Amino acid sequence: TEGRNSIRYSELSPLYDTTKLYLVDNKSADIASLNYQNDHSNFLTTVVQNNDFTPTEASTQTINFDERSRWGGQLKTIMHTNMPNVNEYMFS
Amino acid sequence: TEGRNSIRYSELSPLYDTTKLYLVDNKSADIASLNYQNDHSNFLTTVVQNNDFTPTEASTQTINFDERSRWGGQLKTIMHTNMPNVNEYMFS
Amino acid sequence: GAEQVYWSLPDMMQDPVTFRSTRQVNNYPVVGAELMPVFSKSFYNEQAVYSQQLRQATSLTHVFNRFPENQILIRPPAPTITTVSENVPALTDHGTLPLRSSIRGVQRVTVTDARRRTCPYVYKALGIVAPRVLSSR
């Protein structure tokens, strides 16, 4: 199991066999640059938390997990909605 | 020669068998913090160029070169002075 | 004042130790240091009083030396040695540093000040890199 479980970003230290990846939408940099036409159901967000890079030039780095191993990670979601009773979208 | 020639800072990537180390005195952080009583002939300066650390809390990290090898590096200096002909310091 | 100058080259050489890999303009990890090429030079006019007595007769009525009768407010005499700055070219050799594996076609260069700002008085800049082999892998 040792050896083949490193997680290299590009230039930081390599991790080993557990991280976390945050898919948030409340970053103040994505509001002005990437997401301009779309809303909270179809947005576009970044993973790197480095803040030496604007997200137009942060769309190039690759968080390459180690090969010669099959990876895979579980998913946890939190959603919150507010729809009325009678509305036009659901034919009511 | 391979293997035993890494240069680890503490958390960045390891280099290999050539760097440079700058002993400057014109940093704007050392003027307000470290050097307050002394002058250009007996000053006290930092080596880390990270600027996430004030130099009072940067006096803890160690740039440890790799063991099982004897190291050693050459020195180049640049000094510039202005003394008068007749003065009191040199009994003239 | 003799200030230092920093060369940066962030697409060919690797980063030196304790430097963060960034693409902001005013950080740009430094690859070598020098001195600003502005020297001094002495000339020894040796007269300095007759050459001041005669200079304000054919060139200067009373524009400088407005009060040519009061002893305290009189024009100061010129020294017997005079010093003027000058600009010379600088040829330097900075030693070896490790370079990257793949080199892109376009490259950046940057020449900064001690307070991380570009000096506008640079007229010519020129560099030559000659790769060699170091330890194996």
Side-chain angles (χ1 to χ4, degrees), chain A residues 62-81:
Chain A
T62 61
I63 305 168
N64 45 359
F65 299 102
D66 189 65
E67 61 188 2
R68 66 188 176 179
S69 293
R70 271 71 172 267
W71 290 86
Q74 65 177 355
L75 181 63
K76 294 190 288 183
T77 62
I78 299 169
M79 69 177 289
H80 186 190
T81 187

Side-chain angles (χ1 to χ4, degrees), chain A residues 10-13, chain B residues 10-13:
Chain A
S10 295
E11 69 264 10
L12 273 301
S13 299
Chain B
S10 295
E11 69 264 10
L12 273 301
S13 299

Side-chain angles (χ1 to χ4, degrees), chain A residues 52-53 57, chain C residues 20 22-23:
Chain A
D52 288 335
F53 298 102
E57 73 192 2
Chain C
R20 285 187 289 113
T22 177
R23 297 183 70 249

Side-chain angles (χ1 to χ4, degrees), chain A residues 3-6 10 16 21 27 39 41 47-48 54 56 66 72 92:
Chain A
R4 56 181 186 183
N5 52 3
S6 64
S10 295
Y16 290 98
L21 300 174
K27 289 187 173 71
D39 52 352
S41 296
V47 174
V48 293
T54 183
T56 65
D66 189 65
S92 178

Side-chain angles (χ1 to χ4, degrees), chain B residues 20-35:
Chain B
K20 285 185 178 293
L21 300 174
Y22 299 106
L23 278 303
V24 307
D25 56 350
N26 204 359
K27 289 187 173 71
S28 180
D30 295 327
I31 297 169
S33 298
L34 295 175
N35 293 317

Side-chain angles (χ1 to χ4, degrees), chain C residues 9-13 102-109:
Chain C
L9 193 60
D11 281 325
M12 185 179 290
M13 303 296 173
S102 295
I103 306 300
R104 194 180 172 87
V106 292
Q107 295 286 316
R108 290 293 296 266
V109 302

Side-chain angles (χ1 to χ4, degrees), chain A residues 1-88:
Chain A
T1 308
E2 66 178 357
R4 56 181 186 183
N5 52 3
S6 64
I7 300 169
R8 280 83 55 92
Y9 163 56
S10 295
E11 69 264 10
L12 273 301
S13 299
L15 272 297
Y16 290 98
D17 71 4
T18 298
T19 56
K20 285 185 178 293
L21 300 174
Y22 299 106
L23 278 303
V24 307
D25 56 351
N26 204 359
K27 289 187 173 71
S28 180
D30 295 327
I31 297 169
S33 298
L34 295 175
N35 293 317
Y36 185 75
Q37 293 293 321
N38 48 7
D39 52 352
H40 291 281
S41 296
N42 197 1
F43 62 89
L44 170 60
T45 184
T46 64
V47 174
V48 293
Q49 302 289 325
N50 209 167
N51 77 17
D52 288 335
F53 298 102
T54 183
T56 65
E57 73 192 2
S59 68
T60 306
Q61 294 92 19
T62 61
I63 305 168
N64 45 359
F65 299 102
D66 189 65
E67 61 188 2
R68 66 188 176 179
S69 293
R70 271 71 172 267
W71 290 86
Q74 65 177 355
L75 181 63
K76 294 190 288 183
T77 62
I78 299 169
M79 69 177 289
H80 186 190
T81 187
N82 45 8
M83 73 179 75
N85 204 172
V86 175
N87 51 0
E88 194 269 333

Side-chain angles (χ1 to χ4, degrees), chain B residues 9-58:
Chain B
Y9 163 56
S10 295
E11 69 264 10
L12 273 301
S13 299
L15 272 297
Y16 290 98
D17 71 4
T18 298
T19 56
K20 285 185 178 293
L21 300 174
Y22 299 106
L23 278 303
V24 307
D25 56 350
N26 204 359
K27 289 187 173 71
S28 180
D30 295 327
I31 297 169
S33 298
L34 295 175
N35 293 317
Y36 185 75
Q37 293 293 321
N38 48 7
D39 52 352
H40 291 281
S41 296
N42 197 1
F43 63 89
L44 170 60
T45 184
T46 64
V47 174
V48 293
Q49 302 289 325
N50 209 167
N51 77 17
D52 288 335
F53 298 102
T54 183
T56 65
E57 73 192 2

